[PDB]
Subunit: 505 residues, 4 copies
């Protein structure tokens, strides 16, 4: 007999596991337990802090919720109005010396006229082809070209997406982008060119809210804290090392065994196959593709430069920098970096030279957070990536050679993006149903490997819905129908449902 | 305080209300109660019997389930292998002296050659127009022409649908018809013409099971029997006369008041509006449209004629009979009509004449069930419709003039079909949310008026999901996304969920 | 027996008739003569002079020759280099205060940005519809929209063409416009909008030669002068009053009868019908439509204004002036108006006021020639049209209010344009073969009534080809195939053919 | 100075040369003469006779005139109604044991059903593609597929045209086929399949007339005979061996020199170039491509078999016979073969056996004329081609193994078809203008090398129009605009024109 027995064991306390846990706690029916190898819940939605006091998320993390239930849990966890800051969704594409507002194609008037001609011509071709199309695109590349035409494709989405995914766009499927027909809005694009006009897709009603304190990680610490502590096991004492699917027994690193009736595994499915010592599943999961994510963080002295301004996140298609995305993380909260009166020595100048003095000087400070992808098709030199990022900051005019860097951060995350390759679905549909037959709900960004439902709210709800499937026979909508959940307001499920109301009576 | 108080009240014990009751009974959380003005549950899925022992459903009722939950409750209600008879769909369309296999449009290959030309020419125009189409059809008619061409439109689709919906095809929308109306492949249809082949396997009901006893009504009586009797109130004692939405109080005919927290109403929503004395809702519901259904039953002496054979239901686009559909009801179960040893006198010959003898004679007997639609746009002479149907049977060679009729049946059902008019949705999106704000779940064939989810299983699940929404924050999928639930096997929700399994240990 | 007998009789000594006579005179086989009711040959290709010495053509006449034969005869008629002046086409469209380079539809780049958007959007619409179009436009208007979109239609093509054709675009066919109306390339038009470029090279008249003396009329006087005088009868003595198609006899106003074997008639065919006293033909010819042309000439004191420059002819779609076209006739030849030392009093100022004195002041002088159309759908007030035109010149900033007008000219030409109405071809194919079967070749601008072969070179060659058909069995290519003659260089026929070369040996 | 001087010299007395001469003789202005290496005029439109008395044209020659002038000359040559026989244009395609009426696609109901499916499916694809087509086909093969679809193309036009042109369909251009858009008549093809109907494109309207005597060759002997004898030089005495273009002299076999002012050459342009000792033109003309034609004639004993019947010419796509076309030449005139009373011995039976007697026996007789193509891409074994053709007649069931063959015929014509290769036009637009610059009108089937104007009427008119161009400045319509002359009634030019009517009075 196992050391512990529960009805539903949840492996992992990132967003997905915490989702499963929150729903179990609410339902308060079957017995349950959540574990994690980390003392701090949050997984890829965690936050680090440099010794100099600069916070960094695991790359740019911006919440766009598709679910009321998700909002309920964030509100419960961080209920105060000053637990959060609201910002407009401001983003730009760096192209040929210019900060081009997103979406890129509505703003090509910033480019030289010759290129505008090239762009419009390509989109005219794409429009005339769309008018007679009778097939769906089969690759990410085809989808891009049908949406944008060759000129606009070549300038942004093609080179940018290689830098993001670390695989060519021709090797990825496009179904994950949704059911929208791949066709250009030629009139919109041509109008802005003729008018010599720019327009970003943000404004007063296009916002996000970001945690006042502790970065994105502050959310999941708060959410996790609403759980009954005795049902949680976080840290080395909670690391799963073996999974016996036949006995429905899990073994922890310290030797503790847990019996379960249903298992919700939110660890990377390739690691689950290993933990299971399931040779067949190992072979299958190894056919999945992913990229690793390098997060580089740079702490800068001085008030926010005019050239940066209210920019939130930024895209880099060009090859004069290794990062695909930059975030002005200091714009997300005042508390993502030290206060102005905090004294810190200058480590280096942005051109790499030494400071004139090693004295600690006061702020104020601002902060840039960078992402660089890696795969077998796109290697990254760990010894030089920081320096190359900083040079990239100079090249893209985010920093001047004279800017004073006071803090640096670099961490590599092995499983960063699950890749929507052409082969993904053919693989997943062999893996996930075999786990299912063993009463294992493998769910999450790397639990079920689907990027289009791979954000915080999706992950959280994957865990919620998996529990709802286990207990109430609910349809796992987020898992099997990303277009469905992404295209509606999901308002039905709440942190307080009829079931808990009628019961209190 | 009212006479009785329940958390959830269900009005109506047709399939929809019984679905609500079954889910409420399974969950066993909130207190509940189901009422019906009729002593016998079943509603439009009930069965009458003539004094001579011939059973008739409310027209042809063939079960094609989209849900494992529905299957679970039917199996529970009628568990024995001999509770059911299994049949293949044998369906034909009467067209110019011939029986054309359903679907008509995929069986062109059986008509006169000169008519095959008209049909194939039409489909060729349609195919070429469809090749450059960039707009969706807006009316049922436009749909029909775009996917079939004029030839087939004029020959079958248009006259038949007027005949069954009792409004012209130009007055109906077309978002409802995914699993109802087969759109023909030009190549497939042409290929069958060339080869002289047929193709009768389109759609959901290629095999169905029919209750051995008591007609379709036997199911819902049996399902109702699994409910705790003290939580049911069927008959004059359970007739709802007043609804006070504001006090959340329902008043029954005998003056019994019932207080509720949540209301699931499965009566026709226009009658609900009347019962609420809500003159705003009355005006809105009167913008809906419906047809009435006349059901005519004819009991015939003799062994099943060769010309009839294993035919199940039959379509009649032409003008030589008033009915749009005939069901060989005696093919569905041997217990739908008297055994051969039953002695019955001949009431009339099929040509209308009086029988040679008034002596009771033995069988065997077979049985035809006919449907005739009526609306403000398609009036019916009530007084002559029985005779007109019988003559229609002679006209279409279903009966010989000398066939001996031993039993007749005619009953008018005022609300038969909720019509997918062009105005339907605009009206419903006013009505259903307004009731929703008053904590009223109006659901069902006429409860929510959507024919594309108007079958027994849909209705049942509308009830199940309304409860699942009220208690568990479930999405009402069947209600809001007909194409979604009709396009998948809905396996997740079971008559025994994890909730009950875990609780019982 | 009649007074005179010839093999071929030519009626009319405009370009078409002179064409006939030239070819007859070249061939020098069959006997022939040419008559005209006018003493001066030339027809609508003649030139008037005001008493103050200002020449005016019958509206803007610019030669654009498709035929070597025509070139041969003009060179023979006017062999000296200084018999001619060469000019580039400098043509513009007046639109919202600006001069837009011809053709309008290819110079969108010149309009305000907001008009530019409207125009391009319309062209984008048309481009997309044209990609799947499988029918030809039936009317001029349909053609316009289909090839240019609504924006350009409304802004220029529709008002301009009503103003010149004196019927709406919806009343005209569109098979005539190959070499008259440029079809805009979406890419080219958009590219020039983006770059801010112009495109003024479209068409056949990018370079023209104009006679140094006597206006366009100087050409036909000279051409007629190369004919043998005794074969001509120009003046009252050559006015045709009766045509007896049966006896093949023509009666002149002075009573002269001329018998013919073949008749080439170049007078308006409706005039021919009346002179034939052929009532059926009169009927048919009244089914044709034509507009009248008002020519207004304005002689102005001053050296050529800078705002005028090298402009040749100008289009006016707007309703701030009565005329559809202005020609800077003084730019065509220095001898179209008096020399600078010619003394002339000011008749009026352009603002309409009388001048201070009757003092004759010297030049130099420049000259504007205006055209205003009239039809039963577009009346012209003849008593005011001159003043309206002059006010028009002020409204369009052609003349300053203070400009000094020293000569004025107004003349109405009843048959100005043969309208390409919808009915035109149906009517002509009843008229011309009937005249053909009576050995009458009816040809020319109003002889055969086809504007697309309605220019001086066309007209001339219609006469030439008629003679060639009569004598040498040649195909009447210009008559029956406008697109064929207009799309090629017609170099084969010469004023000296092999026939004459060999005969002189 | 030369032995003879003329204004216009014509080399060749095939149809093209005779056309030139007929028009020269009609105009009767410039001096002229016509020469030919052959004593008998006619060229490839001549006729041979075997020693047994069977006539053979140079392959199937069927007149379809596009010109009145041609008809005038034929009718002048053979004016009696019994100089000609009239027949319906009856042709079939041999395909899988069947004689399929032409055109093939309207008669595929004779094929197996499974193949009808494949054909119709292919043509449906073609129809759908044609609806969105925005390009012209570039090759003959592309044109075939767009016209017929894949399945129909593979059965007839693709393998048949390889057998005709002796080059792949992918190596030929398709402009020569005319201006008709390459698109299926899907309804016409489908309608005949549905009706099970066959219908060839002949009837009372669709006829040809064939010479009663002397075969096609008789026409040209008769036309030549209307020429004044002393202006002709036919035989060894008229064989051109040298052309000196710079000196405008031709030298004949017997050493006679002829001076000309204009030269109409109708010999093959590659021999013209050789004769000109113009190495540049030699090199250019060698880049043209042509196939050689083998003609095989088989005289058969017996009355016409029922299986042959009224057939005229037959196409053979399949590879069980070497010939691409067969003609039932005995059906064209009863004088193409001996009378019934003529006695001939059997040479062999169709299976190759010896007859059971060498005695002469009487007729009647019938006759088959076959065509086999040869090129460098498709060799022909001259020594076995007769026997292979005869074996082909048995394989195609045209002859039974027992049929008695009483005459055989085989002749190879080196220049047989001028090939419309992709390269033809690029080559010809270099050859013809250089010859033109030297006053050489190279015209005819191999004179100007264009098959689409390569028939007897076309050829004749190339000579006629050449002369007309030389003398009267006419446009050479047939040379330059094949679509134009093939698409209209060319009725203007007559054998008696006004010129001769007027001069004779
Ligand atoms: O051969 C046929 C018979 C019926 N229908 C369509 O199918 C729909 C549903 O008819 P059915 O008998 O399936 O359903 P019911 O009326 O019983 O609910 C009708 O409205 C018809 O338009 C069709 O397209 N082809």
């Amino acid at each position: 007999h196992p050391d512990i027995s529960v009805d539903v064991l949840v492996i992992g306390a990132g967003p997905t596991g915490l989702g499963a846990a929150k729903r179990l706690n609410q339902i308060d029916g079957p017995s349950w337990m959540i574990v994690d190898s980390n003392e701090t819940p949050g997984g890829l939605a965690s936050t680090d802090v440099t010794p100099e006091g600069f916070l960094y998320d695991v790359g740019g993390h911006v919440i766009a919720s598709h679910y009321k239930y998700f909002d309920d849990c964030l509100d419960e966890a961080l209920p105060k109005e000053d637990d959060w800051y609201t910002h407009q969704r401001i983003s730009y594409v760096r192209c040929q010396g210019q900060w081009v507002p997103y979406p890129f194609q509505n703003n090509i008037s910033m480019l030289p006229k010759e290129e505008q001609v090239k762009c419009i011509d390509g989109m005219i071709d794409a429009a005339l082809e769309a008018r007679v199309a009778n097939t769906k695109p089969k690759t990410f590349d085809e989808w891009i070209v049908r949406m944008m035409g060759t000129g606009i494709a070549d300038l942004f989405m093609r080179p940018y997406n290689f830098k993001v995914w670390a695989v060519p766009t021709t090797k990825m499927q496009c179904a994950w982008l949704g059911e929208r027909v791949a066709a250009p809005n030629l009139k919109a694009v041509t109008t802005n060119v003729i008018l010599g006009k720019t327009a970003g897709n943000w404004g007063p009603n296009a916002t996000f809210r970001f945690p006042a304190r502790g970065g994105t990680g502050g959310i999941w610490i708060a959410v996790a804290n609403t759980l009954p502590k005795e049902k949680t096991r976080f840290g080395e004492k909670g690391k799963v090392t073996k999974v016996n699917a036949n006995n429905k027994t899990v073994t922890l690193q310290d030797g503790t065994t847990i019996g379960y009736k249903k298992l919700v595994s939110t660890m990377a499915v390739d690691f689950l196959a290993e933990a299971m010592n399931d040779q067949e599943l190992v072979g299958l999961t190894k056919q999945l593709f992913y990229s690793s994510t390098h997060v580089i963080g740079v702490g800068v002295r001085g008030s926010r430069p005019e050239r940066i301004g209210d920019k939130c996140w930024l895209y880099f298609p060009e090859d004069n920098c290794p990062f695909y995305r930059a975030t002005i993380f200091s714009n997300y909260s005042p508390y993502n970096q030290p206060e102005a009166s905090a004294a810190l020595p200058t480590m280096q100048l942005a051109d790499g030279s030494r400071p004139q003095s090693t004295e600690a000087k006061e702020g104020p400070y601002w902060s840039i957070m960078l992402e660089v992808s890696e795969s077998s098709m796109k290697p990254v030199n760990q010894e030089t990536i920081l320096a190359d990022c900083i040079q990239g900051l100079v090249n893209t005019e985010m920093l001047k050679p004279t800017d004073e860097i006071v803090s640096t951060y670099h961490r590599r995350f092995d499983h960063g993006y699950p890749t929507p390759t052409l082969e993904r679905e053919g693989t997943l549909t062999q893996i996930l149903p075999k786990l299912q037959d063993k009463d294992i709900w493998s769910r999450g960004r790397f639990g079920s490997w689907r990027y289009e439902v791979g954000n915080q709210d999706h992950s959280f709800m994957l865990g919620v819905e998996a529990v709802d499937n286990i207990v109430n026979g609910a349809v796992e909508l987020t898992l099997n129908y990303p277009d469905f959940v992404n295209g509606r307001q999901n308002t039905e499920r709440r942190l307080v449902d009829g079931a808990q109301v009628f019961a209190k009576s």
